[model samples]
Target chain A: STMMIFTGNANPELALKISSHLQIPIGKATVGTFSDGETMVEILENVRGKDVFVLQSTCAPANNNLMELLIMADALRRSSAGRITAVVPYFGYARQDRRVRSARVPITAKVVADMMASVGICRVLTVDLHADQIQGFFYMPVDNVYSTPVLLEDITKQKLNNIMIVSPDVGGVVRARAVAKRLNDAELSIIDKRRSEVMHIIGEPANKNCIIVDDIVDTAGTLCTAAHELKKNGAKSVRAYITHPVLSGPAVNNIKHSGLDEVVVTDTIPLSAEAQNCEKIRVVSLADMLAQAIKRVNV
Target chain B: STMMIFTGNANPELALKISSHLQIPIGKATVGTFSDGETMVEILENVRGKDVFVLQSTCAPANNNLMELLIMADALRRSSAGRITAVVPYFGYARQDRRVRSARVPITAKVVADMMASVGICRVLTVDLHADQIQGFFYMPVDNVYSTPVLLEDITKQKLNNIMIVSPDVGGVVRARAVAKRLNDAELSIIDKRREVMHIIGEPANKNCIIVDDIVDTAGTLCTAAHELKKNGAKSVRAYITHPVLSGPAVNNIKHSGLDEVVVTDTIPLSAEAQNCEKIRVVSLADMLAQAIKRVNV
Candidate 1:
């Protein structure tokens, strides 16, 4: 009665894992689309004065998942839930966070954030947001938990002792540095390349097993090309540790044939069948990490 | 500029007509979708400190249109528009206004209203809502304009002297009565039908019948009522439906129904099929909507 968790059709598997880890069953609710594909939600149990979390990741089919999340939050608010927290594992439009003065485009991430707040979401609990500044878009509390610990724990179990962390692009240097610092301040490398041709590296990759750290892998183009480049520069082996596996188009094909030994990803976005079937692709679940965070937020 | 008008992908044709009526060029904006089908809106013109009216109808593909409207409002609000009035000509989910205590379903109309307010909409101007009480759901002032004057003028031109205004169903008596009152207090008839079958409650013999209602979706009830009225010897049945939500066999049904003609307002745009149907005709509400906007701005 103290706290309840629910989910739309976005990623119920992760929600169930979080529920099981917390030893709490998922709250009863019906979340589906109508025959016309409009999102519909109905809460089946009492949530009066109860703190609630609705788990929904705005991943692929992002618009549908986003509507589902908003409608579910609305249902909970109308049903008298004391507080509502949106557990969005993968925030959809987080990449479109900046508004260029000349481009005359929407800062879509801000729009998504405002929409969530408008629909009675009192707090947001997400993992590894595409941009750190997205936290400020919400007026309420935002717990932007890191997936670094989960990634680090998995990397340690592999015993890749002679490892040098690599940031695939200049923008990912900080993320790679954080992973390096956690690994007893191991050496770090930067892949310096423009979106155009002519790619190069900044640090030593020769004779060292390299691991690339990045926030997302949409098409896997940058990730795969960097892996091949690292091997081309005489690295003993190359692997990728990505936070969000937005393995959209040809991502699996790229990773399957790339110059990497393996690619590690978190279950922030649910895997497509191709990603799950790829032999080189590995998944590390964030269930326990999110479960612990939910408990702390409840306190 | 003191006032600016914008719109999404819902019904830009109506927005252009409204713009022309107001003698103002439509404000430039990019309202489109991303590659993944998510709505995208970018205000290309400066709207800061100006009264802005965004015209969008929650018509077919209602979810996408609804998102486009919301995203546009969010963009305008973030750009510091002084006041944002959502001109939703056709409000979707208006029918799901009530929550049955046992059905355990959402009152979705209330949810749409709340979402509009949350995205910084200051006012709403809509036409011929399915339920009058939907206005109470919004904290802002909702100007629920009637399409009656437009329909009345069109019907007046027809000059059907011995006409009786008919409410297509029991719930539409108020709408039909208002129309009937404007028609020199003509006689009224109510189609007293349940979900089961159709029946007429008033005399229809030898009278030119005009069915009145707020919306026409599938046209099942409208067509059925027309057939029943015609069998009762109603002469030359027609309809004045405000919103043309002709979905799923609606055009075919109306084309083959007993109704001689179906008059619809341009609140929601007609599909190519609906436009081509010989029995369906459109009445323009742009002038009245433009005047309403002008009055609101003042």
Candidate 2:
């Protein structure tokens, strides 16, 4: 088949799942590292005259995973792949969308965007960036998908005491409000980020469990702090529903130790070793949603 | 003394050695990993108004080590460090210096340069690159120092029979020629890389021979050449690589290979795996980086 989809060490399992969904085999590649810790990619399978997709999530160990995607694109190019699109379900370093003062801090999102395009990636697919403007960062056409349907469907399973959605910061109120309306989680609240100060409280989270929704989770610092405030409101338990499990640093460690009762995340990002071993953490697959999107694009 | 140096697990020994060279204590910083394997760094000591340098040689775990430099740069910059320079002893992805065939390959060296610049790095200092032109990859000032004198100084002590220097590849002839000329050895032999190393059998002094190159990571390519050298009856095959960017299982590869000894400069730090291997040895470029740091300030 001319259509070939591959993946790197970042998330080979997700790629294989996509392959199964498409009824095609995954392309073979040795995206390994050199002794001095550099990326070494060798296309093990012939990809000539084939439209290829490389699935890699620049999640944890963000730069390392990111480089693997770039090198895979470069390798496929040298190996004469017909067309290559980077299928990044979770894009890292998308937060700094712009320089506030237009000064020293780089727009890191654009750097990755330019690198992917420079390495011959014609198209990109990612989900739920911290900000929507990250799509404009890429010079090429980018398809930013939302897992809203999937989240809405999954959130229904946890039929608990008319759940209340909490926005950890003021910026997330709009998003939490949307989810609250759809999931009918009854009400929403806003709390100060970093500092566990509550700003808005319509219905106190008393006697009801708390659910903190965010797209990305790193270090688990802010989530822990938010959960801490909900505890003050007499919330029974804390749980996080995140789209991207950046789970970087002590995120899993904190997620396990935090006041959170259960941590439900999407498959956009892989789980850390600690996350895999922890019973409290569960990942719902987004493969079918991703497959449908690609299938639509193929048509 | 205000010039601060910090290192990660990648190469603390080399960093500590660099600390000794400047008569300054190593800066306190924790470049650790999070549960999700992301780079997590915390500046243990204040670095305000100090010129800082991070000594993380991106060797085997290339991206992990590279992230250390980036996160450390970010940490130091925000920590009020006056001037910061990323002291990358071994510049990675330098092989793709240019797009030899237009779109097939990227000038990844420039990408590394752009990334360093992206974080607002002031300057970059590195050891001898595989090619001299790689210095042009950066927009800012790049200090490319020679490990040759240090390498030469070490090689002279070994003083075996009139040495027979071999340039296995034509492209590396100039480098081999330079080493040969500087060392004032007996003869310089140019061979078809793999096939050429075998041609040295007809040479007068095959013993006390050494292979000179810019960088040696996994020892795969270098190992292949050394095997040919040994099969041809050359005595004691040793390799002189400026950047000991030992990537890919270079430890086991070199230890198992026909290479009797491998001489690598500290342009890239030797890892824990690199230390235990008896055949491997390290030469310091501290004086080189330290000299450059002092010169930049002056």
Candidate 3:
């Protein structure tokens, strides 16, 4: 069976990069919106019995992106593709993995997961999910790759001493520790939340080059606030690296005025015009790493 | 288990009307959108082991409406609803029921059906499906109800003679015949498209003309067909469309078209423009749907 790759309107630029790295052109497909904004998809090539992969990240316009991917997967399944793999660079709604309070709120992660499986998605490839446990939500194989390797490659080049890895929130210690352990067991700090109307820092940030890590930076309120706190607490230099730049709601303005030297983000979600021009926000592409993950999983 | 009804942003008016008819107020739920336009739904009431019905029509904004319904069903299921019935008055993508050509195209109807079932939808209740076979696409029980009885009641009030029931297209003969049969075997007319420039199979002269169909989007075909009927010397032309998808230019066309009246059902919400049109009259399915829901729940 032949191998094919397709992408929806979600993140075609990254898809093209992945396809280019794999030395294969994207499969023929028409992913468009109808006059009434209905997601319409049509396969323009023969995918019958072929190994097909559809790369579409459920990013910002989450519902529209999600619907586009679902429709594309449905198209591939109906065309009798031998296998269908979904390459979601960013899995939206991952933060809603569980209910914090005993309310009737939906575990939206599971709902999104079930929707994907129903559309005949045989496998999922994503990166740096907010909850590692989100992998279990899928019925098929899900490879939740890390941006650590890509982020690490960039961090090591700085060659700074007295480094301290910071988890912006208490819930992110596990994620922050991964980077600390990889940096030859470097020291770790946690930005704890007691919320008695004041911020609290559990670990020493004074005189250390602080690097705050998180899976997402939506609105940048927490990220910028943490950066300001770290800087105010006499940290040598405050810099943050987040994976998904959900960069919504005055995030650019917040980052522009924050004390952080730089806000490193990945290209999981495309940057907005303002975020791109802020000068504080820099994006690192996950194209090559995701390209490798696709090959490994297909094997 | 208590019976509860909920609705997404798709058609809350219809949902409220249905709930009112059933004498059960709508379920407590927050079906809203996040700042980024992401659908966010949270049940504010306990539905644990309750028979719940989610009324969301997949209409104009098909993708958003469909997602809302899916997410709501998922919420209901996770909240331990005894049975979740999707009351989708207008099922979108029903027109693309099958492969029209040899090329590989998706049967989008089946895709939507599978999605609904995946979200733990136990049953589906939709009205005037574009294709009857769409019922078979779902793994769950589907009640594809018709609006003919509702429309027929209104038609019978006129009690005009020399009735000529017309199927706007060849594919709708069965639907047109349904109305004709109920009217004591009224004369039938077929609008045939030979592409040899179009012709009518039967005369419409000196008769009360009625066009019947499932959906009326854009209204180009219906209005043009109605115009032709008038040109052929029909006494009066009227239309009884089930789902008023009435999209772009539809209201304008219906306003100036040859038809005397364009009747549609409340299965789909009418636009303000369509509602304001003097020629467009709406027939409510609230009582009929409420009766069906009561029966289905029992």
User: Candidate 3, residues A31-119: lDDT per residue as tens digits?
Assistant: 88764456777899888888888898898788788878887887788778889998999998887777667556667788889878888
TM-score, model 1 to reference:
0.86
Q: How many backbone clashes does candidate 1 have?
A: 0
Candidate 3 lDDT, B1-298, residue by residue in tens: 3788998888778887888899999878888876555678898888988889888889978877887888888877878889999999989989878877644666678878888887789999989888888888877989988888999999998778899999999999999999999999999999987754557889999889999999898898899899889889999999999988888889999998998999998878888888799999988898888888888994
Per-residue accuracy of model 2 over A85-180 as CA lDDT, tens digit each: 888998876774565653333345665687687678889888876788777777788898887788778778877775878887767777777788
Give model 2 RMSD, 1 decimal: 4.9
**Each model: TM-score of chain B?**
0.98, 0.87, 0.98
Q: Each prediction's TM-score against the native?
A: 0.86, 0.79, 0.92
Candidate 3, residue B109: the lDDT equals 83
- Please tell me the TM-score of chain A for candidate 2: 0.90
lDDT of 2 by residue, B1-298 (tens): 6677788777777787777878888877767765556566677777778888777766656777776787677666766788888887777777756666544333556666676776668888877877888777778788878787888888888877668676655677777777888776457765464533344433524565678888776677778777777776777778788877676677888989988788888766667788889998988888777777777752
**Cα error, candidate 3, residue A65 (Å):** 2.4
**Interface RMSD in angstroms for candidate 3:** 2.0
lDDT of 1 by residue, A1-299 (tens): 48999988878789989999999999888888554345677889888889899889998778778878887887778788899999998888887787666454667787788878777899999999887888898899889999999899889998976899999999899889999999989999999986578789999999999999999998898898888889999999999999998887788998998888889998888888888899999989999999999999883
For all the predictions, what are the DockQ values?
Answer: 0.30, 0.29, 0.49
TM-score of 2: 0.79
Better of 2 and 3 by lDDT: 3
Q: lDDT (CA) for every model shown?
A: 0.87, 0.75, 0.86
Under CAPRI classification, how is model 2 graded? acceptable
User: Which of the numbered candidates is closest to the native, going by highest DockQ?
Assistant: 3
Give the count of colliding residue pairs in each prediction. Answer: 0, 17, 0
Best-to-worst ranking by lDDT: 1, 3, 2
